């Protein structure tokens, strides 16, 4: 088997990266594991809301990381060689193993 990792901060970009390896596979009749988004990672920050003197007033922020593995049983030059060249989508990390 050939295995891939798709990781992003945006919940629609992660699915755009999925579409170039899962819809391209279903549209060729390739065998698939089906829609599995996996549990989501998140981390929280508390940040002081004044630039000056006031130390007690503060606000909260979140960063959320989506990680999909998609599973491949019929790999192709249109998938496993094409996801490493994806230019039309910014802010996503693709990693692959043989």
């Amino acid at each position: 088997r050939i295995r891939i990792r798709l990781k992003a901060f945006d919940h629609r970009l992660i699915d755009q990266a999925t579409a170039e390896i899962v819809e391209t596979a279903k549209r060729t009749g390739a065998q698939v594991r089906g829609p599995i988004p996996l549990p989501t990672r998140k981390e929280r920050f508390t940040v002081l809301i004044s630039p000056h003197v006031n130390k007690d007033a503060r606000d909260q922020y979140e960063i959320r990381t989506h990680l999909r593995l998609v599973d491949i049983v019929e790999p192709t030059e249109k998938t496993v060689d094409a996801l490493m060249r994806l230019d039309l989508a910014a802010g996503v990390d693709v990693q692959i193993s043989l």
Binding site: K7, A8, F9, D10, H11, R12, E43, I49, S50, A57, D87, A90, G91, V92, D93
Partner: protein, 206 residues
Amino acid sequence: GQKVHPNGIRLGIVKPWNSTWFANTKEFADNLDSDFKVRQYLTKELAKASVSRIVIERPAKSIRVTIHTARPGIVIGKKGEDVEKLRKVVADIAGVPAQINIAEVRKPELDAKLVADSITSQLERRVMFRRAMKRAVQNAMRLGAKGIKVEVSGRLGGAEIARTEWYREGRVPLHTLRADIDYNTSEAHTTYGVIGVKVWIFKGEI
């Protein structure tokens, strides 16, 4: 009261960003340092170049910056070689080879940063600032705005004064559930003082 940035929650509707990149949590602090350093160097080289926004991508062991300008000719120079200097000067300031792309902007008197540029240039031509503001309001509305505010403070008209002055029409709501506002704050850097300029523009269609 703090009146502090109620518009920052409105990118949760899924949008493309002006810094659009990924990093390991252990490297994010060095990505944020280089993201600051290239933005600074390029906005000092493009300080008077009619730029509306700067956009940063980070491909594999690379960095790709898109310059959005109403004047592509001042960025590129003769034979298009002056942007190859603009690349070369930052080619190692972030530890990766830099790529530089140019994007054209239409309706310049409708962007909150380029409306502030129209005020900085009329203060540089030392003309009556209240006229330049009431021109900036009407020009934006006739060009596609639905609501606008223009505000200025300190050394007003190149004079030995403090104070603040503003003109508005059509509402500029920052706190409501939808408005998709365009916002900017700048400095005019005159021979009498820095003169802070604030702009907010509403266009609708959201």
